[PDB]
């Protein structure tokens, strides 16, 4: 599902080494190591990211994310 | 405050835009030649707007003259449009703080974001065509529009009119490219990916250009300027960043690197990588 | 062969560990993690990238890409 | 606990490969490798961070940090 | 020997996971993965790089490079 | 000890996968790979770096300060 599309309001490095972003008022975590710099770069430049996951409730995990310029 | 944007000729159109800019903004000391500058919008209280009367869609004719745009002054956003024949202000949902006296205000369910407008319009800005003919069509669509929810044709009309008014006010590049469509040849202006990127980076540009002191270049995300003529040929009016659009994160507008003024956040976003071997093998 | 040349319109990491970029209206993917920061930096700085591959069909994988400031 | 919220006043790479940041006048170290460039980029752009740890005295360790847009 | 000194004219990720840069009209490749993002940063920022190698023929390999600002 | 303090005058990736920086007229190298991006970033953004070491050759402690 398309869970959230928006700018990253904050990011957090978690105790379990996963990485959380808050997008459109909801928090999503990912364990994908490749995504950590990319997500911070998106936060730094105000990229619109699209978080896709099988569940979209705040606190859901994700592995799929699109990085847009618009 | 009311201004006319007159589409009769390239002269009348550029004259209209220049008059608006002169009234609502002040040139940057370090990006100004003659009376052609990058200018900073003068501070107005929140909710202040100016009106733009659309004229000259039919060259030099007093017809198609019932469209007015309401523009929030501090950010140049189009808050909605007025049918002056019906005295009705159709106002986007993100502008409930914009109060216009004397008109019937129709509060719309539709917000003014480009995401929303492009969706409802079934029209992407990248590759969007604008001509005198489609501005007349847009005008008619907006005069026919009624109700609280934007239609496809009303949204297409707003995409076209915002591009050739507010976005051209911001970007001399868009002014220059679009104005060819107003000539007797009546060519088509096609909005480019670069045009779109400029509009999307307006806030970031606005935060960086006040720091410019004659560096050899300016880099703001995907936007690059190599000299003052590129800056002036591209940008005309920026936000007053001394608005929420001025800041993404952090508090450092720029870093000078090798005589280029970088948006600090851009540099940070490619200097945050760890050792490549460790990155790629740590799956 | 030169498959696509232009700025990166969007990039996307997929649950199946592929990284898609769209260049000049065409989508290609790579699973080289080396290319994820390189491509995303190219996207956020407006580099012109040239996607190169033996064959250039849509949805093709790639692992050769040139980066130009202009 | 949220120990310190503010900009990174300095950062330091340590002999034991941990990484120290000074935030709100107190020093904190982390052994999370991935935090090293993320903190340095936050530092260079003046990004506000929130250090989270069991103990908040200067010299405490952390494994969790929030990157804010303040 | 100093093979080439100047700004990076283009860079290119190669299918064998090596990385090519063109400097002062000559092309050199490296198999050192750590150099890929560093060279990209240099290219983005207009660093002057000095390619150093025992073989300076264009198309040759390198694993030593100096980075200078203006 | 603070071996050197100042801006990075140049950096260099070496054939043995170490990394050299010149600071305040003196050259130092490190074998820690994650210091390679950290140092180059400091060099590009104009950070003051303080190279620290028991003997002031190789280092693996360095402080970064914005200018």
Numbering used by the authors:
A (entry chain D), C (entry chain E), D (entry chain C), E (entry chain F): 1 to 70
B (entry chain A): 1 to 242, 257 to 297
F (entry chain B): 1 to 56, 60 to 70
Sentences from the paper on this structure:
Shiga toxin (Stx), a major virulence factor of enterohemorrhagic Escherichia coli (EHEC), can cause fatal systemic complications. All Stx proteins consist of a catalytic A-subunit and a B-subunit pentamer. The catalytic A-subunit, which is a member of ribosome-inactivating proteins (RIPs), has an RNA N-glycosidase activity that cleaves a specific adenine from 28S ribosomal RNA to inhibit eukaryotic protein synthesis. The B-subunit pentamer functions to bind Galα–Galβ–Glcβ-ceramide (Gb3), a glycolipid present on the surface of target cells.
To elucidate the precise manner by which these shorter peptides bind to Stx2a, X-ray crystallography analysis was performed with co-crystals of each peptide and the Stx2a holotoxin, which were obtained via the soaking method. We were able to determine electron densities for AR4A-mono, R4A-mono, R3A-mono, and R2A-mono, and X-ray crystal structures were solved to final resolutions of 1.80, 1.80, 1.90, and 1.75 Å-resolution, respectively. These structures reveal that the AR4A-mono, R4A-mono, R3A-mono, and R2A-mono peptides bind tightly to the catalytic A-subunit. In all cases, the common Arg8-Arg9-Ala10 motif (numbering reflects residue position in full-length MMβA-mono) interacts equally with the Glu72, Tyr77, Val78, Asp94, Ser112, Tyr114, Thr115, Glu167, Arg170, Thr199, and Gly203 residues present in the catalytic pocket of the A-subunit, whereas the Arg8 and Arg9 residues of the motif electrostatically interact with Glu167 and Asp94, respectively. Combined with results from the competition assay, these data demonstrate that these shorter peptides efficiently bind to the A-subunit of Stx2a, and R2A-mono is the minimal essential motif needed for binding. Using X-ray crystal structural analysis, we clearly show direct binding between R2A-mono and the A-subunit, in a manner that is identical to that of the Arg8-Arg9-Ala10 region of full-length MMβA-mono. Notably, R3A-mono and R2A-mono (relative IC50 values = 89.6 and 132 µM, respectively) also substantially inhibit binding, albeit with efficacies less than that of MMβA-mono. All peptides, including R2A-mono, were found to efficiently inhibit Stx2a toxicity, confirming that R2A-mono, which is a minimal essential motif for binding, is sufficient for effective inhibition of Stx2a.
